[PDB]
Write an enzyme that holds these catalytic residues in place. Sequence first.
Site, PDB file in Angstrom:
ATOM      1  CD  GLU A 126      -2.211   1.184   2.993  1.00 42.18           C
ATOM      2  OE1 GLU A 126      -1.398   1.164   3.952  1.00 42.18           O
ATOM      3  OE2 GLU A 126      -3.468   1.091   3.138  1.00 42.18           O
ATOM      4  CG  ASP A 184      -9.142  -0.979   4.542  1.00 41.88           C
ATOM      5  OD1 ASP A 184      -8.217  -0.707   5.335  1.00 41.88           O
ATOM      6  OD2 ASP A 184      -9.150  -1.974   3.796  1.00 41.88           O
TER       7      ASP A 184
HETATM    8  O1  LIG Z   1      -5.099  -1.263   2.231  1.00 40.05           O
HETATM    9  C1  LIG Z   1      -4.745  -2.485   2.900  1.00 40.05           C
HETATM   10  C2  LIG Z   1      -4.609  -2.175   4.386  1.00 40.05           C
HETATM   11  O2  LIG Z   1      -5.895  -2.165   5.018  1.00 40.05           O
HETATM   12  C3  LIG Z   1      -3.647  -3.141   5.084  1.00 40.05           C
HETATM   13  O3  LIG Z   1      -3.576  -2.958   6.516  1.00 40.05           O
HETATM   14  O4  LIG Z   1      -2.333  -2.933   4.567  1.00 40.05           O
HETATM   15  C4  LIG Z   1      -2.279  -2.536   3.198  1.00 40.05           C
HETATM   16  C5  LIG Z   1      -3.445  -3.094   2.389  1.00 40.05           C
HETATM   17  O5  LIG Z   1      -3.500  -4.515   2.543  1.00 40.05           O
HETATM   18  O1  LIG Z   2      -2.062   0.187   6.344  1.00 40.70           O
HETATM   19  C1  LIG Z   2      -3.126   0.874   7.004  1.00 40.70           C
HETATM   20  C2  LIG Z   2      -2.811   0.988   8.470  1.00 40.70           C
HETATM   21  O2  LIG Z   2      -1.522   1.620   8.605  1.00 40.70           O
HETATM   22  C3  LIG Z   2      -3.949   1.755   9.138  1.00 40.70           C
HETATM   23  O3  LIG Z   2      -3.621   1.906  10.526  1.00 40.70           O
HETATM   24  O4  LIG Z   2      -5.162   0.987   8.983  1.00 40.70           O
HETATM   25  C4  LIG Z   2      -5.545   0.780   7.612  1.00 40.70           C
HETATM   26  C5  LIG Z   2      -4.425   0.122   6.818  1.00 40.70           C
HETATM   27  O5  LIG Z   2      -4.698   0.119   5.413  1.00 40.70           O
END
Ligand SMILES: O[C@@H]1[C@@H](O)[C@H](O)OC[C@H]1O
Ligand SMILES: O[C@@H]1[C@@H](O)[C@H](O)OC[C@H]1O
EC number: 3.2.1.156
Length: 377
Positions: free
Chosen positions: A65, A260
Amino acid sequence: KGAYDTGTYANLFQRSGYREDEIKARLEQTWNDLFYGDEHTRIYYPVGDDKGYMLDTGNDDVRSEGMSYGMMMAVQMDKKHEFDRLWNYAYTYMQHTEGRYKDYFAWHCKPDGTRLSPGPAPDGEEFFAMALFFASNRWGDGPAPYDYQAQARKILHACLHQGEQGEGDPMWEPSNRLIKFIPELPFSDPSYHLPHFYELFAQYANEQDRTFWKEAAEASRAYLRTACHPVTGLSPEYANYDGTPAPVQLHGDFRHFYSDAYRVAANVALDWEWFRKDPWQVQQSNRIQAFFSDIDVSDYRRYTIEGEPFNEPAAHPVGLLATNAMASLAADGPDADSFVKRFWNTPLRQGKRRYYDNCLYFFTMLALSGNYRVYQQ
Ligand SMILES: O[C@@H]1[C@@H](O)[C@H](O)OC[C@H]1O
Ligand SMILES: O[C@@H]1[C@@H](O)[C@H](O)OC[C@H]1O
């Protein structure tokens, strides 16, 4: 007609009264703080002569991400050196060369590049591909691994055809043309739906896949109409193919409006700005801004999609404010102008939890200044 057709991008900071000079300087300073700022602000870290990573400060790991986000910020800001350092890191440490996930990226690794889990996160792959397409159109292809166009096409080939290579699974469900949460599971994540990138994949991907990508764009626009709450405009973190919140998962309850789902308002707003195709997008943008119009950012909670607040606070309230402000690309209601002003007067987050807020913040600073653009040819 959208910015794709006209080449003209809304500058909502300017429409709102801010000076052209102040705006460019603010955007440049946001870049400087996130990539080169102090120990409590920056999320970018150079490695050796030729690598770099985007740190999830909250989770102390490097995520596909954040890597893919950093590449998109770099190419939108014409910052080739950082783009190339981030891509080289992803290419070298994260991209699988064999097995069920070949050409996919391991969703997270230690900052030193040690993979933590081999499984991919499709929102990573689709940003990598879009950023690499923009790099090719902006700067031109170089020798591997900086042959950006062929690298993009390789990712999107695996995204649709992984099931044909052997034991793996594609990231899109062929039956409904919808992006999945992970390749193995039959549900989705509405924040992963980027119809505006699929329009560009229909131009830039391997020729055999261009029809699919055009259908994916229309399928995703339809899908967000089913996932977003018709009163509040809120969406669940994970959703069934029919748009209803997916069941509670072994790793938690994703039925509600949390981290998200913030990106949905941002994603729909940019599709409206670029392609101007689905006028429901204007009403969706008005609804979510109306929902948050009288709620202080420091009071943002987790919410059910019908808008019932939990006692629990938002983990990333600056991120939520950013996505709500980015909805001003599409919203024409009484709240658009005030969210733009509220955002302008909001600084970058600092300290341990800053990564996610500051990523969403930067994409909003780009978008509201009219600098989140399609790079063609
Ligand atoms: O967007 C997604 C996020 O929710 C996760 O925690 O890490 C990156 C992706 O898998
Ligand atoms: O990677 C992201 C995380 O850092 C955040 O805390 O929660 C959502 C994920 O997508």
